[PDB]
Amino acid sequence: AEQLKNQIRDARKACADATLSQITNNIDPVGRIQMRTRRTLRGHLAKIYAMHWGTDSRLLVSASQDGKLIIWDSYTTNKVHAIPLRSSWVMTCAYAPSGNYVACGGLDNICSIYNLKTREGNVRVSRELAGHTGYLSCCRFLDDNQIVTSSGDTTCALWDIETGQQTTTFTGHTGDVMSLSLAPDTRLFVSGACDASAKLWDVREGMCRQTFTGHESDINAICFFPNGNAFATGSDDATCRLFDLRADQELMTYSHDNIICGITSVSFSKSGRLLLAGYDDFNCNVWDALKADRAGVLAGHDNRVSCLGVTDDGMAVATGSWDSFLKIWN
Amino acid sequence: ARKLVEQLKMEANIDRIKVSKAAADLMAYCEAHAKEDPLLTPVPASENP
Amino acid sequence: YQVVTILLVLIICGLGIVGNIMVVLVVMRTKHMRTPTNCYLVSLAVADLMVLVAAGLPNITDSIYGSWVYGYVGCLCITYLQYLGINASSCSITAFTIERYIAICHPIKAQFLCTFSRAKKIIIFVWAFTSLYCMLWFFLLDLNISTYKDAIVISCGYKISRNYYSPIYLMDFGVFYVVPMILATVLYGFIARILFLNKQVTKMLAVVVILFALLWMPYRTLVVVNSFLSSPFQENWFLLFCRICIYLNSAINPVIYNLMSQKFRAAFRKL
Amino acid sequence: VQLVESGGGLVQPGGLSCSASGFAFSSFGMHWVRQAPEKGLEWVAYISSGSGTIYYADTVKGRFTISRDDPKNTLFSLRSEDTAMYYCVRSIYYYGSSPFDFWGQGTTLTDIVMTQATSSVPVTPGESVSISCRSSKSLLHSNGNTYLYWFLQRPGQSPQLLINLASGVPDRFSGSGTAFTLTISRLEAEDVYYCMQHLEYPTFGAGT
Amino acid sequence: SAEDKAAAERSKMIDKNLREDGEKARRTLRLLLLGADNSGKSTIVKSGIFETKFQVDKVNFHMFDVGGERDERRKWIQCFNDVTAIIFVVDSSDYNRLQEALNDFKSIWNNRWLRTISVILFLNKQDLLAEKVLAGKSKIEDYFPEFARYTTPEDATPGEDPRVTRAKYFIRKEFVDISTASGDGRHICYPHFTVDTENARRIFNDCKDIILQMNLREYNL
User: Fold this and answer.
1) What is the largest CA-CA distance in chain B?
2) Domains of chain E, with CATH numbers?
């Protein structure tokens, strides 16, 4: 069946009989927002690879390459906790929706999980999760006992935290999976990879449900749309694609002429009408997620921007970057 | 490639939604929850930090 | 002697004024310019601007009117902006040389010491060490009025009359001319000792030990011999030459330290 | 996190330490709270994280002192009001914290005003044990968080915390600006209630 | 409020105990060891980021031998562009490997994040290519066809045999030719020839010239 894939993929292309940005081109766009730096969270020293927000929309963690996981206050610019790491080649970080747990993880093939609310006044390492053989690249949190890690041995996983070992492993990836996003609809997640595909996996079932190819080059940014029915992919060739889980084709790909370099992070506002993407041109960019125009540029950084996140209500947006400064807009 | 060739069609039974229906369905998350997003609109400055 | 020299300050102090504004609109405008070497070169850009406009204009109005136009409104304030514009555009040079010496002849040890939090510490240390020095130009400076046939000399004048006003210049000769030009000789020969041993930029580096010790040569000597010679030299033939050599000196400092580099040229070529 | 203080000896008022054990006091506040043999609670002192944000009682400003030996996680001129039993407070603040919670075993040697709301009620189980409270000013800041601190105690023992809803305490314990009520139901055994505020260094308004 | 005023001697007290920690992550120099197979890169100086540290003239170095799934090196290489030098070790051995292990040096040189950091070429086991050619059975002209067409220029190595030094300097010139083709002056290669104990100091006085060629561009000389 070497040629069997060319018949289903050509038939599924017929189910996608249009694009996105022609029906929403006539609607009222964003225009030009200048989400200026309300606060500016200074204190990291090396570059910054990942931040994750809080559930209360006022705390956030951030992961840096000096071996620090700093828990911030979005309101008073306050170092709530600064968690010293052991493996400082950190490429990802996460925050539990209970607000009790954070988890780091990077090139040392390991996901360490940290407990926030404790007695004896600390943030302790709860469950260090070995079991990967490649560089860990995106950890998330579905529950205080469910973490979905993506790694550099081409394997997505799923773990029982209290036990200490995996419950599932999600294979089917040629290149390394770089970035993962859990869904609001709690039974699915998605992960893009270096082989320009993005295998929609399944939390409850076990096997990777759908596939999503379409980039010219590798992929390093995944985020769910907040309805859980779509998601946007940020690649390393200045193409920021969006898809749909039950359509499997390209929803829209936000591209401009002046961007030639990689798109390190992708996030979404609470409306699902602000696609925020962090590029290698030493500055962010606000895309309107429907009409796909440059409707805002969050140029405040001097080096490449690697992370992004909108709150659980849409109020603020923090961006870290390699300038060691994480800058919350409003 | 033997187990992979039996896996390209073992999960290829996805019921497809049209993207034009989805381009009205993705806007259903935008025409609803519109004003509750502080960044799509010029939100006020009373309780906004 | 006075007809063409009115447009001679206005060509060399006006082009240095647009030269130093091209320095600070390259440092403060581009993203990756967060270097220590862009800090001493703004501590030299505006310090040369305090003589490219605060010393080029009081000699510009001196041509059209032989007396001081500003009177006491300016000749106590703008003369403070001619002993700080001189002594800080000649002491950032002392600051930038010891940066350029440690960066080359000890380049590992200057990957760690020299950072943006240390360059901002030394330029603020050196304006405050010299603003609190140049407050001495309030106590020994007052107006003066005299007259002659084709002269009514109300200029930005003086005080105790150059017999007791000497050590404002003899110490200034050994701090802002002797120090930044024998440390540009000892600590640029060491770059020549290393680059030519391991090198084609040593021509541009041999210029500025000559070019900065040649232009502060006659003026720091003139204000040292005017404190030494009773009824001193005050003619527009020679003493205007001791000011033209100053206004072009602070006009070519945007050319040396920011146009003779690969970094700031590509930074200029971005915008 | 088991805390403990030092007892102290009976000395005339005008003629202490909380050597707590086995936790991180270098990231916690370190209070003192006096409790009278006849009346009840009153605030005493403070030391924050970092050597020195020290407050003092208005009747003890210059009296016995407070400290924090943050390496060892330890701690090192009275009156009739200062002839009370001192009991310590563990607390630390961040945007989501539940401060004031753990109390030492302190029965030691011998102001924005707030209401009391019938300070003498005996034990009636089974039904709602709803106590109201009020303060002389609006506790609610512009952020939107009412900073009320409603405490508990035990007969012959150390205090604890009930109100939001702190930790280490049971579940059955449970408002507006300038006036707020609680809805506690289904009272059980091992039950000296309190309600305080901490918007400034003055202090609960009563002594129940 | 006094709660939030006590929630602000966190951020002024974390930085007292964090910026004093982040001033140790910039006093040591970073290297990146990168050798393919049977190259002896574990034996040049002496869980998946096996990293060693060594100090010479009181300058602590810190190289990161990264054991990955394959030699793609595409996406974990972005973490190492704050690094002074990529120490590249490759052996004096079979010539079907050295046409792929020199197509290794060409994907490290023409990279994107590595367009500023200058690679060190650290050729190991110098006394095992003579023993491959003193036996004479090594068909060096077979794999490398243009080897016999040229010969050695002056300044040869003092066991000063010309038939091996014609080959010793051939592979070095084969890699400098892929170095200086498209290098743009920002980064240059630094070849060597060693299993000897002259290995550590030859990275010390060579990363200096990687630094000194930045302070000839950073300090406007």
Assistant:
1) 64
2) 2-219 (3.40.50.300)
For strands E85-91 and E120-124, give the pairing. parallel
Rounded Cα distance between B48 and E179, Å, is 56
CA-CA distance, E170 to E147, in Å (whole number)? 7
Separation of alpha carbons D42 and B15, rounded Å = 69
Facing residue for A122 by CB, picked from D24, D95, D167: D24
Residues E4, D198: Cα–Cα separation, whole Å: 11
Distance in angstroms (rounded) separating the CA atoms of residues A297 and A329: 12
Q: Which residue of A has its CA nearest to B5?
A: A1
Indicate the pairing of strand E29-34 with strand E85-91.
parallel
DSSP letters of C28-71? TTSSS--SSHHHHTTTTHHHHHHHHTTTTSTTHHHHHSSS-SSG
Domain ranges of chain C: 1-271
Instruction: Classify E130 as helix, strand or coil.
Output: helix
Domain range summary for chain B, segments of one domain joined by +: 1-49
State the residue for tokens 């010790």.
Answer: C213
Query: Rounded distance, CA A16 to CA A14, Å?
Result: 5
- Residue with structure tokens 């080959």? E167
CA distance A1 to A21: 36
Question: Residue D5 corresponds to which amino acid?
Answer: E
Give Cα separations from C258 to C87, C95, C210, C263 (angstroms).
Answer: 21, 16, 18, 8
d(CA A81, CA D33): 27
Backbone angles phi, psi at C222, to 5 degrees: -65, -45
Q: What's at E66, amino acid-wise?
A: V
Is C32 within 8 Å of A282 when comparing Cβ atoms? yes
Nearest by CB to A121, from D23, D95, D96: name it.
Answer: D23
Resolution of the solved structure (Å) = 3.2
Cβ atoms within 10 Å of A199's Cβ, excluding its own? 22
The tally of domains found in chain D comes to 2
Topology (CATH) of A4-329: Methylamine Dehydrogenase; Chain H (2.130.10)
- What do you get for the CA distance between the two ends of chain E, in Å? 54
Q: Does D49 touch chain E (CB under 8 A)?
A: yes
